[PDB]
Amino acid sequence: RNICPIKGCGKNFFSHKYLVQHQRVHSDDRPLKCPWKGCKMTFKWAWSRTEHIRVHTGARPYVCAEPDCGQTFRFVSDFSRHKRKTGHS
DNA sequence: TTCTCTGTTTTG
DNA sequence: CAAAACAGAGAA
Ligand SMILES: [Zn+2]
Ligand SMILES: [Zn+2]
Ligand SMILES: [Zn+2]
């Protein structure tokens, strides 16, 4: 059940197909590029590029819906943290 | 505190 | 199913 053979990893995964995608963690290729002009950042994961672009645009797309909370967040993990701490949503 | 990562879940 | 997103971890 999908064990990574690489030395000092040995993680096990929910699926074989992820086990293969996971291998990009053990290579130094960074195939994704930031589209913002001049920025040299590169990525391995598409979500990482997505969140990163918000650093350029300044957006805060995560908007707490709890009545009268009004807080907003740039990064998904920070919105998750707020939910977990407050019980909002 | 801001932000990148990544294993898993959700969406289409 | 593949793509998009989430949730939590945690580097800096
Ligand atoms: Zn591995
Ligand atoms: Zn960039
Ligand atoms: Zn809230």
Q: Are A64 and A79 in contact (CB under 8 A)?
A: yes
- Token duo for residue A75: 């990064």
Protein-covered nucleotides of chain C (CB closer than 7 Å) are 2-10
Distance A86 CA to ligand 3 centre (A): 7
Q: Would residue A16 count as lying in a domain?
A: yes
Q: For residues A75 and A89, give the distance between their C-alpha atoms in angstroms, rounded to a whole number.
A: 17
Residues making up the annotated binding site of A are: 4, 9, 16, 22, 26, 34, 39, 52, 56, 64, 69, 82, 88
Is residue A65 a part of any domain in this protein? no
Cβ-defined contacts of A65-71 (< 8 Å, 24+): A65/A89
Instruction: Determine the structural domain holding residue A21 and report its residue range.
Output: 1-29
Query: From the annotation, which residues of A make up the binding site for Zn(2+)?
Result: 4, 9, 16, 22, 26, 34, 39, 52, 56, 64, 69, 82, 88
Question: In whole angstroms, what is the distance from residue A39 CA to residue A73 CA?
Answer: 23
For residue A14, being part of any structural domain is answered with: yes
Q: Phi and psi for A16 in degrees, rounded to 5?
A: -75, -40
Q: Is A75 a domain residue? A: no
- A60, part of any domain: no
Q: What is the resolution of this structure in A?
A: 2.0
Q: How many domains does chain A have?
A: 1
Residue of A32, A3, A36, A6 whose CA lies nearest to A19:
A3
